[PDB]
PDB file of C-alpha atoms in Angstrom:
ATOM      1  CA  UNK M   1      52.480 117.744  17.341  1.00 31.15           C
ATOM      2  CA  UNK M   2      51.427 116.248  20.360  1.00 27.76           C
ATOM      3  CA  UNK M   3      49.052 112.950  21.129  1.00 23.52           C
ATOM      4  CA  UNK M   4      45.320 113.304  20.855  1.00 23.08           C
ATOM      5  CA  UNK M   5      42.869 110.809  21.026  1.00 23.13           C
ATOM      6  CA  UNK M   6      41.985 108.561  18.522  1.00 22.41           C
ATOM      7  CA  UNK M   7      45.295 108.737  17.151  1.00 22.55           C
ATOM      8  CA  UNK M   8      47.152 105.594  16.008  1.00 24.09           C
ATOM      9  CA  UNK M   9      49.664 104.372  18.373  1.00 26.42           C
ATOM     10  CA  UNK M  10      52.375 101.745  19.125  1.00 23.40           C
ATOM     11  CA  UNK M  11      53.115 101.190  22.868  1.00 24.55           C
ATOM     12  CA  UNK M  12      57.087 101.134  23.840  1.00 24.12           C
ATOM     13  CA  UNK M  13      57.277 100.711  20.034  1.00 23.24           C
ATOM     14  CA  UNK M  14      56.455  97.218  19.280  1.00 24.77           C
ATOM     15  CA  UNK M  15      52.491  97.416  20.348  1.00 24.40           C
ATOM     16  CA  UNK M  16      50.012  98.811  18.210  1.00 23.24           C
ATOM     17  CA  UNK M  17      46.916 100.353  19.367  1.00 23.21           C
ATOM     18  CA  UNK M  18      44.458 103.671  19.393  1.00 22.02           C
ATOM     19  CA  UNK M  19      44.927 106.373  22.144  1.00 22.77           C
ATOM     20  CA  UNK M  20      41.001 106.918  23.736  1.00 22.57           C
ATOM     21  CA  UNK M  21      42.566 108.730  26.777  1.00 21.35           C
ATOM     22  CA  UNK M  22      44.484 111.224  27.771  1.00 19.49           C
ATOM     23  CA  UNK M  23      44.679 112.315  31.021  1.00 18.46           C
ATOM     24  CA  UNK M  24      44.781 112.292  35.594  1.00 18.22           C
ATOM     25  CA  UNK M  25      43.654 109.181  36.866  1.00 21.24           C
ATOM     26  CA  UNK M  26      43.172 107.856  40.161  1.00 23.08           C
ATOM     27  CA  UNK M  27      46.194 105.360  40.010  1.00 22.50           C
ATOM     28  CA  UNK M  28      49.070 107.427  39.985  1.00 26.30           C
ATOM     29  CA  UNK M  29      50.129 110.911  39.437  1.00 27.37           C
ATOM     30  CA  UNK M  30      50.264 112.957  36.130  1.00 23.25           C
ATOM     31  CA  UNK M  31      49.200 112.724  32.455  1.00 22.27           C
ATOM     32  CA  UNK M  32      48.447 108.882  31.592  1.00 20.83           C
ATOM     33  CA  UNK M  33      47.913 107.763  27.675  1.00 22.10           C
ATOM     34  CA  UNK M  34      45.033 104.870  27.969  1.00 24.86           C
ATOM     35  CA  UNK M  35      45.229 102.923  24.811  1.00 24.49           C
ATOM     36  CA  UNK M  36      42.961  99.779  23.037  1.00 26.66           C
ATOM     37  CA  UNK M  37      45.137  97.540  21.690  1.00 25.25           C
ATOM     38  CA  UNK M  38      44.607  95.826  18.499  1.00 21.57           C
ATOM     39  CA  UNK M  39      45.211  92.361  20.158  1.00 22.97           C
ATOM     40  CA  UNK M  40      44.268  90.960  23.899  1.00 24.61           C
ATOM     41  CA  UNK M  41      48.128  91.878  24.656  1.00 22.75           C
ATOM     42  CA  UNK M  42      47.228  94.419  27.339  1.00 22.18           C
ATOM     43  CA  UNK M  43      46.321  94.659  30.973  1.00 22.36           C
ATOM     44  CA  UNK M  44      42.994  95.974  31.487  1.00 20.89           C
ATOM     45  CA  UNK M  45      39.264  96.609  29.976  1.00 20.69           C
ATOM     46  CA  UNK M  46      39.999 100.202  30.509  1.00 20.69           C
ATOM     47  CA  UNK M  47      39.239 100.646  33.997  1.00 19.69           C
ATOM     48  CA  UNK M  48      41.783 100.114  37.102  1.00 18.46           C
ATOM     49  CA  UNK M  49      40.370  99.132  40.469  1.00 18.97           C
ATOM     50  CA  UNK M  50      36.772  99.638  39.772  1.00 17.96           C
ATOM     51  CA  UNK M  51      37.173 103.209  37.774  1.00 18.04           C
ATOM     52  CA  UNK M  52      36.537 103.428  34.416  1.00 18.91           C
ATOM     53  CA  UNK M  53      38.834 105.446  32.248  1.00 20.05           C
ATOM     54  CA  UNK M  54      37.591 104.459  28.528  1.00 17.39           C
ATOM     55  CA  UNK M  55      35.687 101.154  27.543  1.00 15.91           C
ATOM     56  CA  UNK M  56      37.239  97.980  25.950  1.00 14.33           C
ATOM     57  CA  UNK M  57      37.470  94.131  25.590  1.00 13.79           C
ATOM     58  CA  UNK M  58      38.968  92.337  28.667  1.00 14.03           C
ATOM     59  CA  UNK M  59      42.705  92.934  28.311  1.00 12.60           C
ATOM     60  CA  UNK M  60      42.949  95.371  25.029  1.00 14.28           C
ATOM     61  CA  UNK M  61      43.145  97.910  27.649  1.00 15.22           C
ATOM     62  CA  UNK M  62      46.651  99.489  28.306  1.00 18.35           C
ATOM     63  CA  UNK M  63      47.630 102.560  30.546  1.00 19.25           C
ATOM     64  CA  UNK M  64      51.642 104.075  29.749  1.00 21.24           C
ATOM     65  CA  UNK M  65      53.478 107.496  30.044  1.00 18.97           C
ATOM     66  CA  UNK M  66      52.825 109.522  26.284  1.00 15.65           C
ATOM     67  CA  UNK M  67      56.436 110.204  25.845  1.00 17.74           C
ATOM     68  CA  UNK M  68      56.731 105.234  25.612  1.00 17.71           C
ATOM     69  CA  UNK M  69      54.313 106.205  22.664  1.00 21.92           C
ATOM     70  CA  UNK M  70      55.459 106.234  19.077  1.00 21.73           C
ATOM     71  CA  UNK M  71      53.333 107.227  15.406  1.00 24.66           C
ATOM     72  CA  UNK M  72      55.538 104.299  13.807  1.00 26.70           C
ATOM     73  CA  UNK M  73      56.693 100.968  14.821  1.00 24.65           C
ATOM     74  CA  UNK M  74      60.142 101.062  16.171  1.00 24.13           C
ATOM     75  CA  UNK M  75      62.211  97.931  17.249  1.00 25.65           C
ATOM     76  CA  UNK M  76      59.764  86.219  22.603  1.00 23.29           C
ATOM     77  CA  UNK M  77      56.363  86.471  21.035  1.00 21.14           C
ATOM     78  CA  UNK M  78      55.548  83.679  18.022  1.00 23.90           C
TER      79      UNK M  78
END
């Protein structure tokens, strides 16, 4: 099965978070998984240089590859 949206997520394993899109964007080539984070651990509100891809809190916002995604957690933060 692959990703959808809304589906529960953990980013290169270790960060957990909901996928609200899936798709092209305007910031580099190819499909792009744009996640909201469960903590301000991310890089973005969900847009990138003024486009807006889904809608979050400043820095819940994370854009990565679907394939760095995992359904479970998988293993210099306190």
């Amino acid at each position: 099965d692959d990703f959808r949206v809304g589906e529960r997520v953990w980013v290169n394993g270790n960060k957990p978070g909901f996928i609200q899109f899936l798709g092209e964007t305007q910031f580099a080539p190819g499909q792009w998984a744009g996640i909201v984070l469960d903590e301000p651990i991310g890089k973005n509100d969900g847009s990138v240089a003024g486009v807006r891809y889904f809608q979050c809190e400043p820095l819940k916002g994370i854009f990565t590859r679907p394939s760095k995604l995992t359904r479970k957690v998988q293993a210099t933060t306190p």
